[PDB]
């Protein structure tokens, strides 16, 4: 889940 | 009834889907980063293609097709999974896949962004690196020729590519029908080689 990081922000 | 209470824990409470917060609860559940390998061949599993989702179908689908209804039962098949993942074919698919996850569907985009297909592509040759990876990851982030993006065709021969030539070189043709990128990659990993 490589985007996850940036949709949690 | 195990799978259903398993569903709920980490589903959205408005959409009929795992989100992104469920989804960072349940790869901390499961003991695993979100961005590592198994996650991805979970997915893989699931059939999700959006990545940071699974929609009620696809978790149950894919629950069922690894025979779990828990996050016990789900790590139990990591070994397993990580075999198969292993086997040609399995591999095939497991690398098609890996291109229409990575692919914003939800604007959507066509091609893959450079970095996540950076990233992927890392990712989804971790069982197996092939010679001519890590330099053609350095090209990559250097991006000698600007590139935008990573297109489905690209990505789909570049399986072969590795396949074909190096370590040596010996069988790359400049006149070979390759995505031109290679023949960009081919030239700076030449001249590389000479300045090293």
Redo the contacts between chains.
């Keep these: 889940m490589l985007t996850l990081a940036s949709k949690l922000k | 009834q195990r799978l259903e209470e398993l569903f709920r824990r980490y589903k959205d409470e408005r959409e009929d889907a795992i989100l ?2 469920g ?2 609860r349940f ?1 901390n559940d499961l003991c695993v980063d ?2 590592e390998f198994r ?1 991805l061949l979970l ?1 893989w599993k699931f059939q999700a293609a959006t ?2 989702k699974f929609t009620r179908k696809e978790f149950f689908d894919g629950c069922k097709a690894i025979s779990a209804d828990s996050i016990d039962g789900i790590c139990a098949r990591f070994p397993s999974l990580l075999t198969e993942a292993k086997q040609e074919d399995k591999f095939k698919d497991l690398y098609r896949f890996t291109f229409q996850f ?1 692919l914003d569907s939800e604007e959507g985009q066509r091609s893959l962004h450079r970095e ?1 297909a950076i ?2 592509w890392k990712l989804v040759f971790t069982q197996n690196n092939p010679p001519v990876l890590d330099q053609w990851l350095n090209f990559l982030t250097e991006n000698p020729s600007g590139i935008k993006g990573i297109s489905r065709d690209t990505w789909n021969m570049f399986l072969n590519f590795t396949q074909v030539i190096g370590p040596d070189l010996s069988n790359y043709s400049e006149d070979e029908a390759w995505p031109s990128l290679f023949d960009t990659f081919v030239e700076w990993e030449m001249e590389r080689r000479k300045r090293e």
């Design positions: 992104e917060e989804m960072e790869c979100p961005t996650v997915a990545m940071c990575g996540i990233a992927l």
